Amino acid sequence: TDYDDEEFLRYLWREYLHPKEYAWVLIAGYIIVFVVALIGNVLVCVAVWKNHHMRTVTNLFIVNLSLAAVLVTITCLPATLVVDITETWFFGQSLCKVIPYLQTVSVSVSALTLSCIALDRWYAICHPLMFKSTAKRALNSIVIIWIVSCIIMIPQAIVMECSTVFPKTTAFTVCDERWGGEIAPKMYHICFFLVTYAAPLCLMVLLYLQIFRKLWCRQGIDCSFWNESYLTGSRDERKKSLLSKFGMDEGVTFMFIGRFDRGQKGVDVLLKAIEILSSKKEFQEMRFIIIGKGDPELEGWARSLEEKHGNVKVITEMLSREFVRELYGSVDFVIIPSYFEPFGLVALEAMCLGAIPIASAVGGLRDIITNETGILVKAGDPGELANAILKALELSRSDLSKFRENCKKRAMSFSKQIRARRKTARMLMVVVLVFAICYAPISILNVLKRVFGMFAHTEDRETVYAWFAFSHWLVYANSAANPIIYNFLSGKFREEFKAAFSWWWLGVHH
């Protein structure tokens, strides 16, 4: 008649010493999370492996984010519910090593996968080469993440130990970390806080802040304002009216709008090109509007060409938003001879209103301007810009209306891409924020406990064990939350969630 088999009876003989009866609010909260995390995360894998349009690098990682969340929801979640209520280990020495090893590996996989998503997004949106990763490269990085996590969390499995604690007189079994010397655990739990929480979050905040700044602000094209409908009449009716205001008659109009910079916007390239062209009879067919302020030398050069030629006009005063809109929907060509332009907001603004851009083949403008929607040249070459202004005149003897419609369709198509990339970043950023808030209490509490040595001398252990149990539930709640973020913030996931639910209950879609 051996009593080694029964640990639950020994817990009943001690149950009176530490009652809680907030156990029902924790059991209810653990069941709710268990169902939502298991249903939601499996739907994530299914929705990606069903639809081949969904197999993007961002989503393949998101599946590897749900694979680790299903692993803990099954193996680690029920064991945490029992321990945080009974304060006893009922699962034996072998599972005292495996279960905590499975949740440290899962926390490492989750931090490194979220960092690779930010990394992949930054190399695709911010890096000047605009890298386009493949599904093969995303799966090999996924394999490596699991290999790395399984190695770096091996010391945790060695350290866990299941021991019977004798001090009323009825002993009970517990599973905890057991280190030799109080010097190694403080070193390790610093390295755990860094690799799993601190270092990834600082990396992702720095990568997503550059992604937010580019997509929201630097590429923030307001299509509600830069629109064709705000104009009146036909384009040649607006052009000749505009020229007559500056004392010019009809002619192919060229427009520059930008600061007079020494190295950047490139008005010095345009000023050099006008002097090249000024020696030709084709010059008197052209009209130039140079709008800008800045370097005093280039100003004097622009006012010197303005005095000499009657088809050059320089505007140095501050222009209203609607005024630049009137120019874009009037002039024939807009010249952007930039040395450095990583966003090309001027091109999107001008093409949306019909202007045909003659721009440098630099990153922001090279992406937007194609072979059928404008003319590209070398950034620092005034002679190649002079040739392009001659080609724009030759083309302007025919009807340019076909090119204007291509420009409007290309700038709108490019704004759709920005708006699509924006929604994906906003969704990923919420996931990160929710990851930060969910792991914040348990990461801080384990640093204060294991490194700083807090909670050792207790004033009241109820509040400390309550905060510990609450923070532990929040970690599994993060696995419940992410599929809800995908449903609220991604239309591709939302419809695929509805199609998998309709098949599962009704069989109505498939």
Ligand SMILES: COc1cc(N2C(=O)N(Cc3c(F)cc(F)cc3F)c3ncccc3S2(=O)=O)cnc1OC
């Ligand atoms: C599920 O069951 C058990 C879990 C644990 N552990 C644990 O509570 N945490 C808390 C924790 C964090 F601090 C940070 C974080 F990002 C995620 C976490 F979950 C650990 N904290 C530091 C190192 C290793 C672990 S841990 O081994 O995962 C211990 N004993 C168990 O059962 C006997």
Ligand SMILES: CCCCCCCC/C=C\CCCCCCCC(=O)O
């Ligand atoms: C105490 C130090 C422990 C070191 C843990 C740091 C783990 C980082 C190592 C590998 C992370 C895997 C990144 C895979 C590269 C893929 C790049 C990509 O395409 O995003």
